[PDB]
Enzyme design. Structure first.
Site, PDB file in Angstrom:
ATOM      1  N   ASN A 142      10.646  -2.918  -7.797  1.00  0.00           N
ATOM      2  CA  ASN A 142      10.253  -2.736  -6.383  1.00  0.00           C
ATOM      3  C   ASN A 142       9.033  -3.601  -5.984  1.00  0.00           C
ATOM      4  O   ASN A 142       8.454  -3.381  -4.915  1.00  0.00           O
ATOM      5  CB  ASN A 142       9.939  -1.261  -6.090  1.00  0.00           C
ATOM      6  N   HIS A 199       6.082  -3.590  -7.307  1.00  0.00           N
ATOM      7  CA  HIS A 199       4.837  -2.849  -7.474  1.00  0.00           C
ATOM      8  C   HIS A 199       4.299  -3.139  -8.886  1.00  0.00           C
ATOM      9  O   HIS A 199       5.104  -3.301  -9.803  1.00  0.00           O
ATOM     10  CB  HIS A 199       5.093  -1.344  -7.335  1.00  0.00           C
ATOM     11  N   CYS A 232      -3.087  -1.345  -7.412  1.00  0.00           N
ATOM     12  CA  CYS A 232      -3.518  -2.740  -7.340  1.00  0.00           C
ATOM     13  C   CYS A 232      -2.310  -3.426  -6.647  1.00  0.00           C
ATOM     14  O   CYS A 232      -1.166  -3.283  -7.128  1.00  0.00           O
ATOM     15  CB  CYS A 232      -3.760  -3.352  -8.723  1.00  0.00           C
TER      16      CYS A 232
END
Ligand SMILES: O=c1ccc2ccc(O)cc2o1
Ligand SMILES: O=c1ccc2ccc(O)cc2o1
Lengths: 268, 269
Positions: free
Chosen positions: B190, B192, B227
């Protein structure tokens, strides 16, 4: 995994993991490159060689000699999806006094169809002085019994992509990713930067829009010098064209070349 | 891998790979953490949940709700050697309206001996607004049939390490590793940053001499904020202590916004 019937090649199956896939839910080229190293290591173990990424024989250890990659070339037709089983077959060929070559074929376990192929060139080096060497007759004659004697090539076609000369990228680069540095996860058991980390660093300077709309089809990478644990790398890329790119990794300070390469991308 | 007889837990075996090991020729803690996520994903898939790191029910997807990790706690007695087979068993527990917990037990496949254990706390969040929320009765009642009803804890002990409060590291840090940034390999499907990357970043500020003479025994890590792909992180570490203990802090390189805090315990080799 196991050696084949004739004992001249090795096969191993891998189930693609959740953390090994990218945005298309298929294995990244770095996952593929890590699986190629793993099957190469299991093949070396099965026939009595060193297991540390250097695949040394008894005489090589006495002489403090190691095998080191000069070039990696990978072509992927289909990346395996998450949960899929991929079968990889690998073998080595002796290339006279120049060095050795390790080749691989990737297949979908369910269809038996070839989904990718790879080839790599390896040269002998003194591990302490880092001085390259031609292969001696006494060393070469010792490992010839583990290779097919007749040529067996993953890339047979004459004048194919895997043997093409790569030019040096001229400044200014079209794209760049600066200040890349390895972390402990990028290191191998001998505290050296893993060969696959350099493929990741080369790819960092490809724009995200190319990655979002294209699939990587071919990557060819030359290895000139190691990145040390405390070194910092800049990754440079320029379009040469399907989209084709020319790549250069160099040390962030003095600009010392560590790798050069090319990539070919197909629109999705 | 497979669900156990009662269908309330999942087991999977893994052969440790050549690139997964460190200087001791045993699996790194990041390899272990990746295997814990892989067996968690295979357990979710086996009982009909989402496969993307968010383990969502049909109702959660309708409400744009996802599960996100608040804490990971891992204790390793022996790291599996290269070529060794490690068996991992995992299960989930509903913790009322607070959230859920996923626990794991690691064993040496040949000896059957417990070589490690881990526990994680998960909270519900709206995917778009990033707003946390308590678990609703209609959502909780839907997944209770996939969990053991009686408590089953990887860390049963009284005031054990896994639930201890972690303080905030005060400047100046004793050690630091600055300007850490994720590359595409650190991202999940995704886009991330993978949870395991933060464990690697925490460990970057431990001096190499501690890593060369000690084995990591316990790591506890709180997750406060993500982050992003274009963020830059500084990793800070201060000794708090045969055994060495450290306090850790990851913060954004510019403004100093906290992303994680944690503690590690190391035993001399
Ligand atoms: O697995 C192999 C096969 C051939 C081979 C040949 C040379 C060598 O040093 C290592 C090798 O490992
Ligand atoms: O594999 C599991 C087991 C229980 C469980 C419970 C809640 C949920 O959202 C996902 C889950 O996945």
């Amino acid at each position: 995994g196991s050696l084949t019937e004739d004992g001249l090649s090795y096969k191993e199956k891998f189930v693609v993991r959740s953390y090994e896939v990218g945005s298309n839910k298929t294995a990244t080229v770095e996952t593929i490159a890590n699986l190629l190293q793993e099957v190469g290591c299991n093949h070396a173990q099965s026939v009595g060689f060193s297991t540390d990424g250097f695949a040394t024989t008894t005489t090589m250890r006495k002489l403090h000699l190691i095998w080191v990659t000069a070039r990696m070339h990978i072509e992927i037709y289909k990346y395996p999806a998450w949960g899929d089983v991929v079968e990889i077959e690998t073998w080595c060929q002796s290339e006279g006094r120049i060095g050795t070559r390790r080749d691989w074929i990737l297949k979908d376990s369910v269809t038996g169809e070839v989904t990718g192929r790879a080839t790599s060139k390896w040269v002998m080096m003194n591990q302490d002085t880092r001085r390259l060497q031609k292969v001696s007759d006494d060393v070469r004659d010792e490992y010839l019994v583990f290779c097919p004697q007749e040529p067996r090539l993953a890339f047979p076609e004459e004048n194919n992509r895997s043997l093409k000369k790569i030019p040096k990228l001229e400044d200014p680069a079209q794209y760049s990713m600066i200040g890349l540095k390895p972390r402990r996860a990028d290191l191998d058991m001998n505290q050296h930067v893993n060969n696959v980390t350099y493929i990741g660093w080369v790819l960092e300077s490809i724009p995200q829009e190319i990655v979002d709309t294209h699939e990587l089809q071919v990557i060819t990478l030359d290895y000139r010098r190691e990145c040390q644990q405390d070194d910092v790398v800049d990754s440079l890329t320029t379009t040469t064209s399907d989209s084709q790119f020319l790549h250069l990794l160099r040390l962030s300070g003095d600009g010392q070349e560590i790798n050069r390469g090319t990539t070919l991308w197909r629109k999705k």
